[PDB]
Ligand binder design. Structure first.
Ligand SMILES: [Mg+2]
Ligand SMILES: [Mg+2]
Ligand SMILES: [Mg+2]
Ligand SMILES: [Mg+2]
Ligand SMILES: [Mg+2]
Ligand SMILES: [Mg+2]
Ligand SMILES: [Mg+2]
Ligand SMILES: [Mg+2]
Ligand SMILES: [Mg+2]
Ligand SMILES: [Mg+2]
Ligand SMILES: [Mg+2]
Ligand SMILES: [Mg+2]
Lengths: 115, 98, 153, 100, 84, 206, 127
RNA sequence: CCGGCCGGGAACUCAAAGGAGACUGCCAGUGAUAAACUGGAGGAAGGUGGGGAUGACGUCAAGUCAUCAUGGCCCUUACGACCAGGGCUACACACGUGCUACAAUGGCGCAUACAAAGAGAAGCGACCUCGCGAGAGCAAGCGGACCUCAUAAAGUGCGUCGUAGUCCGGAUUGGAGUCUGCAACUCGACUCCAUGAAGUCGGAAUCGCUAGUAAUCGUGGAUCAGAAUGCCACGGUGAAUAC
RNA sequence: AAGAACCUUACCUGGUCUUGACAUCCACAGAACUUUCCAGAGAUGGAUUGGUGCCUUCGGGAACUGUGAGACAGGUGCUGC
């Protein structure tokens, strides 16, 4: 119930639980379970410690949690200090993939700031 | 077998055409299977009518391609030349096939 | 409308029981034109309530409806400054429609799980005058009683 | 539209027809997958050197009676306004007002 | 982005300028308009004035811009903020 | 309000098409452009001859042009020297062999196009528009049209506020589709701007 | 001998052949139970037979095309109705009083210009 | 070789032509013995059956000189023309019109049924092989009731989730990629992996709709090299209400 | 607006052209056409391999190109009062 250094829920099925690892979604969770030979509908608190060890080994293959976080952070910071268009967009906290900013863009710009 | 594809923009005119097709193919001696009506292609177009704005003001035009099929099983030697010399009225496209 | 409606639309009685009353109930419960889902939910609720009580599905449904059906409602009339909440007696078709609608509103607003469970529980409560539907009927009758002075109209 | 605009379109059509074959060849090298890297690179460069107006995507359909770039209808080669006028005057075969 | 089968895209005239400038040493900034061109590995150290609509923004090419369009480092809009 | 074209709304019902050639999506645009060019050239070169109608057919890689005209002698000329040149140029424009056939138009006073052209020519010549309109209506109702409506709109008589005036006699039921409403328009380029003439002529039923 | 009828509903066309037999109903080479998932559809198919009380003494061979489940069910119902019409004319009054002879002439109304659907106008605002 | 597959059949569904039908025709009552109305039979349709096209004289000196034509004025080493880059895609904000949601009438997984209408020749692209997928290779067939687009989805059967900002919800962003196009940075669509936001039904106010309509589910087309949640059509399921 | 990456595009920054990109008409020269090299962001300018014909009053015209003055051409410039 502690894979890649984080607590994962014991009450949920294995596929749903493994998605709690920052870096594993449904697809990677299914791949991990298949490679470790564990049913997709089994609940975490009902796996043998050997099975959890194998799961640890599998999830160790992929970059997750802190390593992934700092990888993403160094990619963003490289964009930043290069100061290309995407670096400038990231600095200003505006949409980065060519969306419209005349309206919407609330996810990047934050909620309404009245004048 | 001889295959005649008649395409026209007017059902009356194409009916005249296919009538005289069968009359010629029967005077020549050969027997005819038809005419067969194949489904009309109703090509529809929608166009704004004002030169400026007014989006809800539209005309809807339609072009009805009527198509008839003529079959000539047992194609007599005179039948073939008669059909190819017949020279249909304008407004009909005739495709001849074997 | 300013003219008059023709006869009401024909309704095919539901297959399991052959009751147009239940057909109307299914239609009222239906959402986004998914009559299959509405009928399955209604049928599950009916069998569940019949099993919990003992009554036949149809008669138990009739009892639940009757405990919710109103008799007089209030409509708005204009004279001036204020409005008249004039109490008018209801015709039976509107009675059944209102009873069904109130039952379905209460069932949807209930906090259970499957809507069949919600509907069975709500109808069971109506079978002894407990649901939000019978509460709404209570409110309608006591409002009409309050406004009874305007009944003469 | 403007006479200059119509002239531009004519020039683009002429260049596309003139240089069509060479563009076809070079794009064949590029999208061929068993062509050497040197071949694909030189083909990219030569396709660059070919004039831009030769690209058939550079063209813009225009109403042949007014040059209007909007509201085109490929079946007739005219914009909506000209199609409407000719159709009502009867200058379009078979076409007539639809109702269904 | 560009399909990998087609490889990278460099405009021929900019490639010529770059190869001649690199083989003949440090020179004047490469005044160029090819914003759509790719920064190749042998681009380092070159100062290139990439057009942006009215100006030729100077860009000192370094290692970490390899594989990026030169037009990305020359912004084409001006913005300082509303009612500052 | 605006009104539907009395020709277009009746094309498939009681009117014919001014073009009855069949072609598919490969040929439709080119044939339409060539028909437009031929009609434009014919009208320009036969402005004097009073060409009432131009029908075009394309039997088989050929173009047949029937020119319903009010002065067939004028459009033909001596023997056929004029129609021969017209046919040559029409064939060159259409890129195919040509065949010009002149059609007699009896009574230019019951044809909407010819009436409109006459009225426009008078307007260019600066005749009073009220007199031109009254003359047109009287001529048609004496030739025996069951009804006629004439409308003239624009800067009439050098006015600076454009107005519309229309005369009418008999019946012109534009709503009935089976009624024979021959309708046509023309423009008159006067020194004070353009003036539009529209003519409806109701000639009968079925 | 086989008695034939044609039913139509929405855009469904159902050829229905009836011949006296053991009460077997075949729809598109498939039994009714596993061809129609809706008990309403099964009721719709069997409605004429049960209302004329001839449910077991006829055999149905039916082929239907076009439409959806309910449209096809109505097409079947119309097909049996007409097949029994041309079987006997004596049950005509009963079937009309029931309301099965009538071909329900209700199609999907065409979409119109300036409306989102048949009648759903775009949302209006004074300003 | 269970596939109309082949021989065949012309019945049937369909395809397209021509006809018939519905007219207040008949009956009853009401009604100024009139128009007509309230019903009833018959009939597929009963009262202008449903829908569409059809927009009267005229009103707003309403809109368009940027489709076009056009009087007058104006520019003409130019206010015309050519070219490459950029912008029309900018964002403290405000409004309109929509899409997806806020979940269990649901989500996900597996199997499976039922459509109409349209398109297509530097075009639609089978089958097969490869790729996890966008797609790639060879490549038939078809200007077509033949071939392709193109397995409809909602629905049904089983399991799962069990009311939680959640297997809801999909924004945003990182990495890796496919296709079109000379070229995808400004500024494309799509795919895989990852991230997983706001949102728990929305104040005053306000909109659409009386039938196969609303609601809901998918499909096609025009424009188009690529680029729809828009627009225009098509079918599937399918109500409540009108005193 | 039935669909702005370049085009569209009418706007902006620069590089350029002015009887002009598109029309007639005047004269002269030259068949056109095709390919190739340089410079320039491209426009555009230098060249030039090949080509040098189609009818013929065989001498010239028909086309297609450049040049040379124009009469003009061009305007998505204003005015929908
Ligand atoms: Mg112009
Ligand atoms: Mg384009
Ligand atoms: Mg709209
Ligand atoms: Mg009328
Ligand atoms: Mg204005
Ligand atoms: Mg815009
Ligand atoms: Mg989800
Ligand atoms: Mg398409
Ligand atoms: Mg497209
Ligand atoms: Mg629909
Ligand atoms: Mg642009
Ligand atoms: Mg006005």
């Amino acid at each position: 119930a502690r894979i890649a250094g984080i607590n994962i829920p014991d009450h949920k099925h294995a596929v749903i639980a493994l998605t709690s690892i920052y870096g594993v979604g449904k697809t990677r969770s299914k791949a991990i379970l298949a490679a470790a030979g564990i049913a997709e509908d089994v609940k975490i608190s009902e796996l043998s410690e050997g099975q959890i060890d194998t799961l640890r080994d599998e999830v160790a293959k992929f970059v997750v949690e802190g390593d992934l976080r700092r990888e993403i952070s160094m990619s963003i910071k490289r964009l930043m200090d290069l100061g290309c268009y995407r670096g400038l967009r990231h600095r200003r906290g505006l949409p980065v993939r060519g969306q419209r900013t005349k309206t919407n863009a609330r996810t990047r710009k934050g909620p309404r700031k009245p004048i | 077998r001889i295959r005649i594809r008649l395409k026209a923009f007017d059902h009356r005119l194409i009916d005249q055409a296919t009538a005289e097709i069968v009359e010629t193919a029967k005077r020549t001696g050969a027997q005819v299977r038809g005419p067969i009506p194949l489904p009309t292609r109703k090509e529809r177009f929608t166009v704004l009518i004002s030169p400026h704005v007014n989006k809800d003001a539209r005309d809807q035009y339609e072009i009805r391609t009527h198509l008839r099929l003529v079959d000539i099983v047992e194609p007599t030697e005179k039948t073939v030349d008669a059909l190819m010399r017949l020279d249909l009225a304008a407004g009909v496209d005739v495709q001849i096939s074997l | 409308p300013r003219r008059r409606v023709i006869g009401q639309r024909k309704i095919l009685p539901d297959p399991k029981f052959g009751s147009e009353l239940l057909a109307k109930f299914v239609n009222i419960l239906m959402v986004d034109g998914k009559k299959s889902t509405a009928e399955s939910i209604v049928y599950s609720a009916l069998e569940t309530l019949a099993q919990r009580s003992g009554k036949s599905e149809l008669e138990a449904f009739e009892v639940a409806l009757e405990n919710v059906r109103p008799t007089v409602e209030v409509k708005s009339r204009r004279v001036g400054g204020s409005t008249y909440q004039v109490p008018v007696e209801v015709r039976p078709v509107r009675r059944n429609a209102l009873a069904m609608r109130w039952i379905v509103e209460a069932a949807r607003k209930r906090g259970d799980k499957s809507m069949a469970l919600r509907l069975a529980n709500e109808l069971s409560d109506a079978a002894e005058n407990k649901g939000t539907a019978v509460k709404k009927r209570e409110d309608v009758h006591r409002m009409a009683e309050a406004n009874k002075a305007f009944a003469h109209y | 539209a403007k006479q200059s605009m119509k002239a531009r379109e004519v020039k683009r059509v002429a260049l596309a027809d003139k240089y069509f074959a060479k563009r076809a060849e070079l794009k064949a090298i590029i999208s061929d997958v068993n062509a050497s890297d040197e071949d694909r690179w030189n083909a990219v460069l030569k396709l660059q050197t070919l004039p831009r107006d030769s690209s058939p995507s550079r063209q813009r359909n225009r109403c042949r009676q007014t040059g209007r770039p909007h509201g085109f209808l490929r079946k007739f080669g005219l914009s909506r306004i000209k199609v409407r006028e000719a159709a009502m005057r009867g200058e379009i075969p078979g076409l007539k007002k639809a109702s269904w | 982005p560009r399909s990998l089968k087609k490889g990278p895209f460099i405009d021929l005239h900019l490639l010529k300028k770059v190869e001649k400038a690199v083989e003949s040493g440090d020179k004047k900034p490469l005044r160029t308009w090819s914003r759509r061109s790719t920064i190749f590995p042998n681009m380092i150290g070159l100062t290139i004035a990439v057009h942006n609509g009215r100006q030729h923004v100077p860009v000192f090419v370094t290692d970490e811009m390899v594989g990026h369009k030169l037009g990305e480092f020359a912004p084409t809009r001006t913005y300082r903020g509303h009612a500052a | 309000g605006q009104k539907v074209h009395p020709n277009g709304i009746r094309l498939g019902i009681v009117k014919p098409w001014n073009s009855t050639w069949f072609a598919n999506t490969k040929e439709f645009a080119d044939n339409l452009d060539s028909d437009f060019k031929v009609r434009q050239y014919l009208t320009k070169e036969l402005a004097k001859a009073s060409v009432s109608r131009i029908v075009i057919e394309r039997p088989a890689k050929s173009i047949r042009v029937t020119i319903h005209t009010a002065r067939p002698g004028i459009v033909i000329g001596k023997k056929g020297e004029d129609v021969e040149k017209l046919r040559k140029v029409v064939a060159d424009i259409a890129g195919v062999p040509a065949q010009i056939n002149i059609a007699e138009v009896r009574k230019p006073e019951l044809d909407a196009k010819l009436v409109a052209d006459s009225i426009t020519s008078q307007l260019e010549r600066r005749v009073m528009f009220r007199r031109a309109m009254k003359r047109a209506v009287q001529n048609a109702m004496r030739l025996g049209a069951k009804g006629i409506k004439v409308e003239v709109s624009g800067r009439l008589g050098g006015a600076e506020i454009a107005r519309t005036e229309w005369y009418r006699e008999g019946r012109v039921p534009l709503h009935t589709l089976r009624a024979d409403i021959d309708y046509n328009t023309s423009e008159a380029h006067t020194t004070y701007g353009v003036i539009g003439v529209k003519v409806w002529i109701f000639k009968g039923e079925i | 001998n086989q008695y034939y009828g044609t039913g139509r509903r929405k855009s469904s066309a159902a050829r229905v052949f009836i011949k006296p037999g053991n009460g077997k109903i075949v729809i598109n080479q498939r039994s009714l139970e596993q061809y129609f998932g809706r008990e309403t559809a099964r009721m719709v198919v069997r409605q004429p037979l049960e209302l004329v009380d001839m449910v077991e003494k006829l055999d149905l061979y039916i082929t239907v095309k076009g439409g959806g489940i309910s449209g096809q069910a109505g097409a079947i119902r119309h097909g049996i109705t007409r097949a029994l019409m041309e079987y006997d004319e004596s049950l005509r009054s009963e079937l009309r009083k029931a309301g099965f002879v009538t071909r329900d002439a209700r199609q999907v109304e065409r979409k119109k210009v300036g409306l989102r659907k048949a009648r759903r106008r775009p949302q209006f605002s004074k300003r």
